[PDB]
Each structure stands twice: as structure tokens, then as C-alpha cells.
Amino acid sequence: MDQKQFEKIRAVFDRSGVALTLVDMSLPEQPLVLANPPFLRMTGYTEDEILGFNCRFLQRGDENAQARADIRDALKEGRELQVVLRNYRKNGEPFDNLLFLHPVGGRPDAPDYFLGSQFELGRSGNSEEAAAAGHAGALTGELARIGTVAARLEMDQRRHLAQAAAALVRAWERRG
Amino acid sequence: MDQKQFEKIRAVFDRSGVALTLVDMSLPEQPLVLANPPFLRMTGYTEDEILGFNCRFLQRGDENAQARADIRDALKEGRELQVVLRNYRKNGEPFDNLLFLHPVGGRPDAPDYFLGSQFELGRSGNSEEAAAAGHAGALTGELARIGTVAARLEMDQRRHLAQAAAALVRAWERR
Ligand SMILES: Cc1cc2nc3c(=O)[nH]c(=O)nc-3n(C[C@H](O)[C@H](O)[C@H](O)COP(=O)(O)O)c2cc1C
Ligand SMILES: Cc1cc2nc3c(=O)[nH]c(=O)nc-3n(C[C@H](O)[C@H](O)[C@H](O)COP(=O)(O)O)c2cc1C
Ligand SMILES: [Ca+2]
After folding, report:
1. Could you give the 3-state DSSP secondary structure of residue A14?
2. SS3 (DSSP) at A75
3. Cα distances (Å, whole numbers) of residue B53 to B22, B23, B27
4. Roughly how many angstroms between the first and final C-alpha of chain A, as a whole number?
5. Is residue A115 lining ligand 1, measured as CB closer than 6 Å?
6. For residue B49, which of A11, A111, B123, B163 sits 20 to 30 Å off, Cα-Cα?
7. Is the dihedral of CA B80, B83, B86, B89 positive or negative?
């Protein structure tokens, strides 16, 4: 909750062209504390409907049982994760979501935040793999700007996140 | 373009994680006027060694003939383009370069500058198409920050440049 740290992330979020969210890991309930305009456009919510609340309102019923188990594990362990979720907009229209999770701040044993970035699937025609990799590359630029990914390491992280995203998209496309 | 706006581009260039170059379109020589650290690391040159030269110093002979004709047409017409070039570092090391070109400033079909961004091929292991699409997405973020890609177009531009990049990789991998 360092002041310089929070506003530094806020400014990056406000300007970014990719959906970004930030959750406060200082409480078990993990409330959302930042959500930027691209995320708001995706989901159909206002900043006030979501800020101070956990991110699970995007789901309905229990269709992401495995993904939820994996997210819980990654959050508790402070690990990066990429995973596809079935989500719903405020108006109820369903959409599939490649979610990128990244720990921010604190120490490897205990980050202060987790950053979320959501890539909407099913709106990139024949090129879901490339568009998801494109999103991973834009996201990595934002991580570098926040400071979470070091400058000397940005190209490796971009390669890694882009291949991980394409691989997950390949699996999602062949599931059905 | 006003000096204030030029320094805004320079600031983006200086802190970008992707290679970026800027070419002055107001002279037929088309000299390089900005070249950022990732570009300098990839090519092996210093700023003093390359600013004021046309970017073709990275090429040799009559190589890339079709790509060069396509570039000349894109520059003349003020259009975007993506193409793969065989290039050489200062020490002579050959490398293949997926080049993105984007017009900057001026008026349509007469930009003040052209922006170039270079993705080095064959350095990304098993995931060449994904790494190149990743570069295209990072690049699109920098275009949005300079203002040359409108806010409402950025998501579509990112998908499009990623698709073009991966298609060019696939074509390259077939040779
Ligand atoms: C930064 C961050 C962003 C998240 N974004 C989404 C999201 O966009 N959609 C979604 O369904 N879950 C999202 N989640 C996950 C939920 O908030 C929750 O952590 C996850 O569903 C685990 O399930 P459970 O705690 O309800 O069992 C996000 C989590 C974090 C930490
Ligand atoms: C912004 C910009 C960046 C360029 N970057 C490269 C480059 O990295 N490598 C290269 O071989 N050519 C690059 N070029 C291309 C050459 O500068 C030149 O336009 C191209 O070779 C075609 O012209 P020519 O046939 O007269 O050489 C770039 C051009 C522009 C406008
Ligand atoms: Ca920058």
C-alpha cells in the first residue's frame, strides 16, 4: 500500500490499451483495487460496482472448477498463471477469457498485489493464437513499465508469455 | 513536426523494450534520426555510427529485392508494411529481421517520419510465431503511446499486426 507504488501502477493502468486489474493480497478476501477502462469495457461494469470487491463476480454457477482450483493455488504460492475462464458480462452475455495472473510487490514469499489481465477469446477470427500472443506482448510491456519485469528480462518474459498464451489458446480451440 | 512532439517520441523510444527506429521522410536520402538501445544492441552499432545514414547499411548486395520494392512503395504511399529482411550486424553476423514500418506525423500519404521496429528471427526457440506476434503486441502499445494508432483502433491493430507477423514467420520458416 506504499503510496508511490500504488499511483505508479494506477497511471500505467489508466493509459494502457489492455484490460488490467489489481487485487489486494493483504486480505484473504482479495478485493479488487484497480480496474482500467479496457477491463470495464469487456465486462460491462462500472469502476464502482467492482472496486473493493473480489473478481469472481464475472463467473456464474460453477463451470471453471479446475481453473478456480489452479488460480487459488497460484495466488497462495505467489506464482504466475495463465488460464482460460468462462465468464459473463454484466448484461449476461457469455465470453471466454484468457486470464494472465502476475504477482506484484512485496517479496516472493508474499507479493502485495496480484495483477490480472484478460484477453477476450472468440473475437479474432482465424487468428486467436496470434492475437493472444499479441496481448501477452502488450501485457509484458506494461509489466516492465510497472517495474515487475526487469528491463534486461522483458524480451525473455515476452517470449515466454506469448508462447504460453498461444499454447493455451490451441488447447481451448481443440477442446470444442 | 514540432520539437515538443519529437521529444515525446524520443522518450518513448528511449524506454521501449522493443527495437525502434525513426527515419526522416523530408529528404529523399531518408536518414535515420532515432535509434533506440534495443536496436543498437541487435545491430552492434552506436548512435554516432548510424544516425544520418539510410537504414539499408544493414543490407548487402542486391539482397531482399522483392522486400525492398515493397518497402519503397509503402514509403512512397505512406502505408504500413511488414516484411522480412536479411541483415548483418556491425561485425558481419547475418540475421533475419521481421521489420514493421509505420508512418508517423505529417499528413496521410506524406508522413513526416517513418517508424521501424525490428524483430530478430531465429532467437525464440520453438515459439517463433508467438514471439513475433508478441513483438507486434508490444510494438502496438508503443504506437498507441506516440499517438499514431487511434485509441479505438488499438485492439484491432494489435490483432492485425500479430496476425501479419505470424504469417510472415510461417512463410520465412518455409524457406
Ligand atoms: C488479479 C486478479 C484478476 C482476476 N480476474 C478474474 C477475471 O477476470 N475473471 C474471473 O472469472 N476470475 C478472475 N480472478 C479470479 C477470482 O477473483 C478468484 O480469485 C478465483 O476465481 C478463485 O476462485 P475462488 O476463490 O472463488 O474459489 C482474478 C483474480 C485475480 C487475483
Ligand atoms: C523506419 C525505417 C526502418 C528501416 N529499418 C530497416 C532495417 O532494420 N533493416 C533493413 O534492411 N532495412 C530497413 N529499412 C529499409 C531501408 O531503409 C530501405 O527503405 C529499404 O532497403 C528499401 O529501399 P532501397 O531498395 O532503396 O534500399 C528501414 C526503413 C525505414 C523507413
Ligand atoms: Ca516506451
Report:
1. helix
2. helix
3. 11, 9, 11
4. 43
5. yes
6. B123
7. positive
Exposed e or buried b per residue across B127-165, where buried means at least 16 C-beta atoms within 10 angstroms of its C-beta? bbbbbbbbbbbbbbbbbbbbebbeeeebbebbbbbbbbb
**Cα(B153)–Cα(B145) distance, integer angstroms:** 13
- Amino acid at residue number A165: A
Contact predicate A149/B124, CB 8 Å: no
Burial of B14 (0-12, 13-18, 19+ CB in 10 A): exposed
Residues in chain B closer than 8 A to A162 (CB atoms): 127, 130-131, 133-134, 137
The grid coordinates listed for A83 are: 488460464
Residue A43 DSSP SS3:
helix
Which one-letter DSSP state was computed for residue B127?
A: -
Q: How is residue A122 written as a grid cell?
A: 472468440
Report the alpha-carbon distance of residue A75 to residue A101 in Å, rounded.
8
d(CA A108, CA B46): 38
Asked if residues A138 and B158 have their Cβ atoms less than 8 Å apart, the reply is: yes
Q: DSSP secondary-structure letter at B134?
A: H
